[PDB]
Amino acid sequence: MITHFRQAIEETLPWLSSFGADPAGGMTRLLYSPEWLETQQQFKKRMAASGLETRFDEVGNLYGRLNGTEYPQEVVLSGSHIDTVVNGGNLDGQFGALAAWLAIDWLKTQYGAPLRTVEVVAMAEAEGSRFPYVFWGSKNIFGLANPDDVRNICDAKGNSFVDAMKACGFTLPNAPLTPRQDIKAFVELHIEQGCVLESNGQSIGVVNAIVGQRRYTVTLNGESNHAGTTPMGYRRDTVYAFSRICHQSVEKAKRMGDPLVLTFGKVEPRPNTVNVVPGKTTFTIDCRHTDAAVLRDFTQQLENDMRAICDEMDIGIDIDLWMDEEPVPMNKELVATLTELCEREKLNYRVMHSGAGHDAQIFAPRVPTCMIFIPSINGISHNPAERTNITDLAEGVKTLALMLYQLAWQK
Amino acid sequence: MITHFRQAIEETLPWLSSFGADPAGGMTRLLYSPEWLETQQQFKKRMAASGLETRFDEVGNLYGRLNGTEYPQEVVLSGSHIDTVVNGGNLDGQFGALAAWLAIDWLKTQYGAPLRTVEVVAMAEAEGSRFPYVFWGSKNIFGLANPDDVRNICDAKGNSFVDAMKACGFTLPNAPLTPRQDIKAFVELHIEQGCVLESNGQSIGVVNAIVGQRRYTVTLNGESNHAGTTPMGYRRDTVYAFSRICHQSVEKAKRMGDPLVLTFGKVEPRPNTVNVVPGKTTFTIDCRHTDAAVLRDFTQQLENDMRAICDEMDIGIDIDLWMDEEPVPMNKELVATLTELCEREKLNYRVMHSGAGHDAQIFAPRVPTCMIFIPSINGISHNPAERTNITDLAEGVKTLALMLYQLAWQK
Ligand SMILES: NC(=O)NC(NC(N)=O)C(=O)[O-]
Numbered sequence: 171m172i173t174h175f176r177q178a179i180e181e182t183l184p185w186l187s188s189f190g191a192d193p194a195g196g197m198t199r200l201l202y203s204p205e206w207l208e209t210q211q212q213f214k215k216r217m218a219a220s221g222l223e224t225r226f227d228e229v230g231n232l233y234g235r236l237n238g239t240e241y242p243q244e245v246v247l248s249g250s251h252i253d254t255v256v257n258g259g260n261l262d263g264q265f266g267a268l269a270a271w272l273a274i275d276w277l278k279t280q281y282g283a284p285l286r287t288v289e290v291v292a293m294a295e296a297e298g299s300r301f302p303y304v305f306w307g308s309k310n311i312f313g314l315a316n317p318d319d320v321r322n323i324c325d326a327k328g329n330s331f332v333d334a335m336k337a338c339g340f341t342l343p344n345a346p347l348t349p350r351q352d353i354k355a356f357v358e359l360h361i362e363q364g365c366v367l368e369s370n371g372q373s374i375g376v377v378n379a380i381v382g383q384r385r386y387t388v389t390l391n392g393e394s395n396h397a398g399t400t401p402m403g404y405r406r407d408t409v410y411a412f413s414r415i416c417h418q419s420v421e422k423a424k425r426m427g428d429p430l431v432l433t434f435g436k437v438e439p440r441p442n443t444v445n446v447v448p449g450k451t452t453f454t455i456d457c458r459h460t461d462a463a464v465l466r467d468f469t470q471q472l473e474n475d476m477r478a479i480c481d482e483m484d485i486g487i488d489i490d491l492w493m494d495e496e497p498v499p500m501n502k503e504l505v506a507t508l509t510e511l512c513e514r515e516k517l518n519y520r521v522m523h524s525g526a527g528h529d530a531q532i533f534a535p536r537v538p539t540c541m542i543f544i545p546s547i548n549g550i551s552h553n554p555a556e557r558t559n560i561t562d563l564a565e566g567v568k569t570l571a572l573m574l575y576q577l578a579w580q581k
Numbered sequence: 582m583i584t585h586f587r588q589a590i591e592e593t594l595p596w597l598s599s600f601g602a603d604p605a606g607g608m609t610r611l612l613y614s615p616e617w618l619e620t621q622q623q624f625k626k627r628m629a630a631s632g633l634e635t636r637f638d639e640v641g642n643l644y645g646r647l648n649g650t651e652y653p654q655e656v657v658l659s660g661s662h663i664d665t666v667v668n669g670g671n672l673d674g675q676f677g678a679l680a681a682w683l684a685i686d687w688l689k690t691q692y693g694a695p696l697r698t699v700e701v702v703a704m705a706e707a708e709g710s711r712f713p714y715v716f717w718g719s720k721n722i723f724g725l726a727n728p729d730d731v732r733n734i735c736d737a738k739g740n741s742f743v744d745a746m747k748a749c750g751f752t753l754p755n756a757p758l759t760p761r762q763d764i765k766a767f768v769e770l771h772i773e774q775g776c777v778l779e780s781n782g783q784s785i786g787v788v789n790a791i792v793g794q795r796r797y798t799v800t801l802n803g804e805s806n807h808a809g810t811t812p813m814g815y816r817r818d819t820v821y822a823f824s825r826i827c828h829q830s831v832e833k834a835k836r837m838g839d840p841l842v843l844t845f846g847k848v849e850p851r852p853n854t855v856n857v858v859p860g861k862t863t864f865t866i867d868c869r870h871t872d873a874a875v876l877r878d879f880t881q882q883l884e885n886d887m888r889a890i891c892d893e894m895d896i897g898i899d900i901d902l903w904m905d906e907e908p909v910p911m912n913k914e915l916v917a918t919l920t921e922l923c924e925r926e927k928l929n930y931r932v933m934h935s936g937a938g939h940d941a942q943i944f945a946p947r948v949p950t951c952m953i954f955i956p957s958i959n960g961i962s963h964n965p966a967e968r969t970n971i972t973d974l975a976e977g978v979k980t981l982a983l984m985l986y987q988l989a990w991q992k
């Protein structure tokens with residue numbers, strides 16, 4: 171069975187990874203890009219060929235469905251996001267969608283139709299890496315996505331959300347969607363992304379909680395001027411202002427210690443020229459913690475700090491909080507069932523939280539959910555070198571299969 | 582004379598400014614761009630039509646020639662650069678080329694052919710705004726440019742110098758050019774760019790020196806990784822490193838005080854995504870001073886500081902000094918002539934240095950050269966709001982005309 175999944179992964183992973191392969195390294199498959207569309211089209215086609223009933227929903231989440239014999243109205247769901255960051259790896263997101271499909275297909279062949287319906291899902295986006303919105307895919311599954319929040323947003327190159335979506339053959343809905351009521355449980359297999367499993371020698375992570383997370387886009391407005399003729403004390407330099415903000419804030423975060431993390435990942439000065447004092451800089455903030463209050467208090471302090479610096483420098487600031495998620499626990503009963511499985515199968519597991527966000531955190535408050543981690547070598551992710559031992563991946567798909575067996579082929 | 586020049590400027594300025602007009606603001610006419618080409622062609626056309634014999638040299642420097650009746654082998658040269666920064670104003674560079682033409686045209690119709698030959702020049706580039714090379718135009722006039730230095734460089738978008746240059750109709754020389762020997766004097770009219778003239782209430786700047794200037798491209802290499810799962814202590818974050826460098830260095834520059842200027846105008850993190858610790862940042866440094874030793878000492882200290890910071894952070898650093906120009910004085914005899922001219926005309930002038938770089942600084946060590954400044958309102962330059970009162974502009978052209986009258990219509 172490990173042998174089967176190994177083979178299946180070796181067969182399909184390289185194939186799936188070709189759609190959105192970036193010449194500059196790794197994967198770049200952003201929400202509603204042509205690469206995004208082609209991935210979902212091809213993936214759909216392969217699931218169909220395997221005998222699954224396939225569909226898009228109104229926003230382009232992809233489903234492969236195998237109907238239940240005794241409770242067709244109850245759905246056990248598994249999968250993950252297909253989107254990536256820029257120059258990402260080929261496991262983050264897509265592996266969990268691929269795995270759910272491989273698990274289901276194998277269960278189908280070994281044990282025939284399930285008692286209750288099982289679905290593979292490949293969700294539209296969870297990376298929040300193209301537009302200033304996150305979890306467009308999963309939020310729509312539960313009608314949590316307000317179309318007003320994306321009707322007026324663009325990517326870095328000025329393409330509107332609405333246009334890109336339409337280019338992929340989807341129409342922005344007029345109002346939030348009807349939330350699904352038929353889901354009994356959701357199970358997301360995913361690479362750990364950090365090195366907790368690898369450094370402690372363990373093979374499977376049983377996730378019991380996911381971190382809280384804020385993302386900001388901040389815009390500094392100063393004055394563009396000549397690099398040579400503008401005396402230093404007359405300047406309104408947005409890159410200098412940005413640097414004080416970044417330097418001071420990272421310093422503060424380092425004093426708070428783990429698990430506070432703080433990242434200034436994207437910086438865009440304008441006009442971005444060697445001999446021009448930059449009169450505008452737009453940058454992002456990503457900040458996370460296991461505790462909601464710590465995350466709130468720390469980030470609010472950061473907002474005050476930024477306003478203080480800017481005010482002192484006579485520079486305009488616009489602070490745009492576009493992701494604000496509470497930490498969420500996984501379902502206790504499902505976490506026990508998973509732990510019990512690991513004990514029974516004699517798996518070398520650990521119980522741990524996720525430092526990454528996942529569609530699972532959107533699911534959790536609405537339907538019973540849990541996550542299975544497998545290791546990430548060197549704790550490298552969002553980097554083309556992201557990789558995992560093939561037997562570890564297979565062990566993950568096996569563990570996923572057994573969980574889905576319990577949940578859908580048993581009453 | 583003033584009214585003629587006011588009208589001449591009001592006619593030709595919006596015309597010349599239409600080539601390279603950037604919809605997003607101001608002017609964007611970079612070396613060897615389509616806008617660059619059109620500008621040079623259109624200017625060449627109008628000059629020829631006004632009765633000047635025009636040529637391009639091997640690199641796209643544009644000349645408008647009026648031959649001299651008694652010493653045709655002696656050339657009095659005037660003009661400036663036609664390129665711009667990104668979203669620049671419409672006076673920097675082009676106004677002095679425009680003025681030279683307007684002045685020679687007017688002198689020609691009032692006093693006929695000059696004794697010596699006079700030429701307008703519109704030089705290819707002095708902004709160093711597109712490729713990592715500066716003064717490609719004026720350096721080639723004197724055979725100072727090594728073709729090897731540009732053969733393998735590219736713009737930010739990956740366009741090679743050689744391809745851009747070929748696309749414009751010019752062939753990269755196999756070796757350094759033969760310097761012109763026939764130039765007797767160079768006069769460059771130009772806006773001040775700073776606010777010295779405006780704030781002291783004067784109308785004409787008699788430039789006696791130009792600053793030294795260094796430009797670096799610095800490349801930091803760390804490791805891209807996941808914003809959430811990578812603990813702070815395990816990071817090699819290049820934006821954080823950059824920000825430490827920029828913050829500290831600007832602080833030191835302020836401690837040195839005027840005339841030291843230091844600018845970090847361009848920053849390019851990779852992959853530049855909100856939830857990715859950026860594993861690479863490329864940024865520029867622009868640093869200038871009136872004194873060669875101060876500039877050298879400060880920037881070398883900056884080089885040590887950056888190395889120290891990066892060694893401490895385990896981040897690789899590459900430092901590429903691509904412009905290293907000494908400060909240079911204008912010709913004593915010409916400055917005196919220009920000063921004496923201002924005295925006789927009772928122009929409210931002052932003697933000052935230029936904090937900006939100019940083709941005149943490349944000319945100076947080879948031919949007698951001087952510059953004339955006119956005010957810049959609010960000391961705004963390298964910014965679409967770059968403006969100078971029309972009478973000041975007229976007054977500068979007038980001054981240039983008189984200066985050229987003495988140099989060329991007199992023995
Ligand atoms: N599994 C992920 O990489 N998720 C990413 N996306 C969200 N929404 O968290 C991230 O940055 O952690």
Ligand SMILES: NC(=O)NC(NC(N)=O)C(=O)[O-]
Nearest residue numbers: 398445707708715937938939
């Ligand atoms: N007149 C200019 O703006 N020149 C520019 N160009 C050079 N080479 O200095 C600059 O940055 O100052």
Ligand SMILES: [Mn+2]
Nearest residue numbers: 255262297552
């Ligand atoms: Mn990710």
Ligand SMILES: [Mn+2]
Nearest residue numbers: 666673708963
């Ligand atoms: Mn300039």
